[PDB]
Design a protein around this ligand. Structure first.
Ligand SMILES: COc1cc(CCl)ccc1Oc1ccc(Cl)cc1Cl
Ligand SMILES: COc1cc(CCl)ccc1Oc1ccc(Cl)cc1Cl
Lengths: 115, 115, 115, 115
């Protein structure tokens, strides 16, 4: 698994479950082309988005649908989503974990990159 | 000044000075149109982006050029930039501060909505 | 004012108002002796804790009563408080801002050391 | 495993490896009595600190030795340590993951609590 996404809820102290996540890759023509998408599991993890063959060099954007998450929970949050944008595989394949911690008016995001 | 941006550097424990910030408003065709931009000051703050009469309800994107900031310091960074996307909602008089705390592989952002 | 504390609320997207903050200095026998304290203001800020002549090098603990803050809002919190422990080092003229961003089950803190 | 600690490095985008962690429990007499201690593994995780029999109700403090971590890496950080203090098992046994994300002048910490 070259790309994994982990999301936690800082209000509840729990995994953020059933969060939609869409991944895009910047195309030749500068557009954001759809790449893969999925939903976080009961452990707040999203696996199986892609494969080492598919996950080529490029600029990727991982958009986490934090607004739908808070709304499903009856809360009106500030951000539309949380998007993480990075160049991947510049020096060869790496494994990327994108972790996000969500509050209604705040989020943070970190990347763990291993070889 | 209904919209201010403040950026701090978690590695040096200082304001993040001279960071480029571009603000876009979502247009009816779903493209992002330039709205306002500037460089943060010596105090990591960016004032005077817009006025109340110009700043109407809508979806806005604040893009912070974290990549250039880290490179100008000789530090290798993960993210291409940091994008903060939110709906400006008239519910009240409504000053928005978008604050961001930067690390090479991580950032956080919070909104402080007052008055 | 060589030492200031600023606290924000990530759930409401506001300053954290009226939060109790106690500052201790580590004594030679390793106990924490009271040094300064106060409640954050309407802007989530706490000024006037100490003066340059009183604030000597040493280890200081800043304890932020996050538990009372959440309870006064009717929100269930995880941490008993937030403690920020650091060495004040004369290397330069040296204003310290200790900033904290609070969630029910999470907080972050950053130091901004300027001048 | 009732108590686990996970630490990440936000500068490198990696697990924070070989971080010392000491756990204390507030005694009858209001003192912090040593409870368990360990070091994070190659994955930045610390397992096996305690058992469901040992990990009784109480107020616990998990002190993460972030200063030694940065120093080993040739860096002079701001904080002495990062301490997390919480009441555990008030409504019966729970499993607690204390996660911390470290930068030289900043850290955040979150708790994931599951039943
Ligand atoms: C950077 O975002 C922040 C993150 C955290 C959690 Cl560490 C607390 C406060 C923050 O915002 C500020 C921090 C310092 C100053 Cl001087 C001003 C502001 Cl608005
Ligand atoms: C933004 O994500 C994180 C933020 C912080 C700062 Cl408190 C710490 C860890 C984070 O990522 C995780 C948090 C908990 C688990 Cl179990 C796993 C991961 Cl990868």
């Amino acid at each position: 698994c070259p790309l994994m996404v982990k999301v936690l809820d800082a209000v509840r102290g729990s995994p953020a479950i059933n969060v939609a996540v869409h991944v895009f890759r910047k195309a030749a023509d500068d557009t954001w082309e759809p790449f893969a998408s999925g939903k976080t599991s009961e452990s707040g993890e999203l696996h199986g988005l892609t494969t080492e063959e598919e996950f080529v060099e490029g600029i990727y954007k991982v958009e986490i649908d934090t607004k739908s998450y808070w709304k499903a929970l009856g809360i009106s949050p500030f951000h539309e989503h949380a998007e993480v944008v990075f160049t991947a595989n510049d020096s060869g394949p790496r494994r990327y974990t994108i972790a996000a911690l969500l509050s209604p008016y705040s989020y943070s995001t970190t990347a763990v990159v291993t070889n």
